[PDB]
Design a protein around this ligand. Structure first.
Ligand SMILES: Nc1ncnc2c1ncn2[C@@H]1O[C@H](COP(=O)(O)O)[C@@H](OP(=O)(O)O)[C@H]1O
Ligand SMILES: CC(=O)[C@H]1CC[C@H]2[C@@H]3CC=C4C[C@@H](O)CC[C@]4(C)[C@H]3CC[C@]12C
Ligand code: NA
Length: 294
């Protein structure tokens, strides 16, 4: 009833924190500032960082499974947003009592705003990226049913806003370019939605190594089985169907929409695709090659 009241008051608008757009209602100057300036970063803390709609939910479920060594009990009985709380939200992981030994947290904050005390910590970060074209599409549909987000408008107008960073959490380009500046540190891992799609078991093993949490063939296969799109779409605790209708309109759509790579080709017209490549080419001039670069 506390979250139900809040959800019904969501305006579907934005406000700015240090030049970056944040959805009104689920975030505030205070909540963001807290996550940015807190000193409570621990050596064994684990952070999942992503630009919205890059497959955060996927990574979160994978690690929740890894932590319990393949046992689905925790993901079956505890809602996902409670198993890996968000740093910047009004009710963040930093404004809640210690309820888990190794803390698992999530964030969409770009590097210049993410918890500053992190740079001198031993805490671990897994940054996940996805083809920005599929990100646009996923974000377009999600916005129509997401209470905190304003309506997208036309596919074409929404695409222009995306390219100019006129969306929640700012520019995708700046987001990923900034975070890749951590590449090289041993407490930072960069992985992509595309890699998990290509070889989920392989990706899971890499994440186990990175976290220092090896798994037997059994637990491994379990993490994989329960991390699959179909399995997660059917898990009431992970698929978001428990949220208030005003926060997420279950009646009109689902958080786990399609779960594939390439759905952008069914939404971008050729002209929009060409305009996107021009923007990408100019913004990603010196960047390394990514799986989504064809
Ligand atoms: N286990 C899984 N396998 C594949 N895609 C998954 C997934 N869990 C979530 N996703 C996809 O990740 C996107 C949500 O991203 P995020 O969690 O960062 O908000 C959605 O993309 P689509 O809208 O393309 O289906 C969703 O379906
Ligand atoms: C504070 C609170 O009640 C929690 C419970 C459900 C949580 C939401 C559940 C899922 C998401 C998706 C994520 O990409 C951004 C934040 C957001 C939108 C959470 C914000 C904080 C919420 C609203
Ligand atoms: Na909306």
């Amino acid at each position: 009833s506390d979250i139900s009241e809040i959800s019904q008051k969501l305006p579907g608008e934005y406000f700015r924190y240090k030049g970056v757009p944040f959805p009104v209602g689920l975030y505030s100057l205070e909540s963001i500032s807290l996550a940015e300036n807190t000193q409570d970063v621990r050596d064994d803390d684990i952070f999942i960082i992503t630009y919205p709609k890059s497959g955060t939910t996927w990574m979160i479920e994978i690690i929740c499974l890894i932590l319990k060594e393949g046992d689905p009990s925790w993901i079956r009985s505890v809602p996902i947003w409670e198993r890996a709380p968000w740093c910047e939200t009004i009710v963040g992981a930093f404004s809640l009592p210690d309820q888990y030994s190794p803390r698992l947290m999530s964030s969409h904050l770009p590097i210049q705003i993410f918890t500053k005390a992190f740079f001198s910590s031993k805490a671990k970060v897994i940054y996940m990226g996805r083809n920005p074209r599929d990100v646009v599409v996923s974000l377009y549909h999600y916005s129509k049913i997401a209470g905190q987000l304003k309506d997208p408008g036309t596919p074409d107008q929404f695409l222009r806003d995306f390219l100019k960073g006129e969306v929640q959490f700012g520019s995708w380009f700046d987001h990923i370019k900034g975070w890749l500046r951590m590449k090289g540190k041993d407490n930072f891992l960069f992985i992509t939605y595309e890699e998990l799609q290509q070889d989920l078991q392989g990706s899971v093993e890499r994440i186990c190594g990175f976290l220092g949490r090896p798994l037997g063939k059994e637990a491994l296969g379990s993490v994989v089985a329960h991390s699959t799109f179909s399995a997660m779409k059917a898990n009431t605790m992970s698929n978001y169907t428990l949220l208030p209708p005003s926060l997420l309109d279950h009646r009109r759509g689902a958080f786990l929409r399609k779960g594939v790579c390439g759905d952008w080709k069914n939404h971008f017209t050729v002209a929009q695709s060409e305009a996107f490549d021009r923007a990408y080419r100019k913004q990603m001039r010196g960047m390394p090659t990514f799986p989504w670069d064809e």
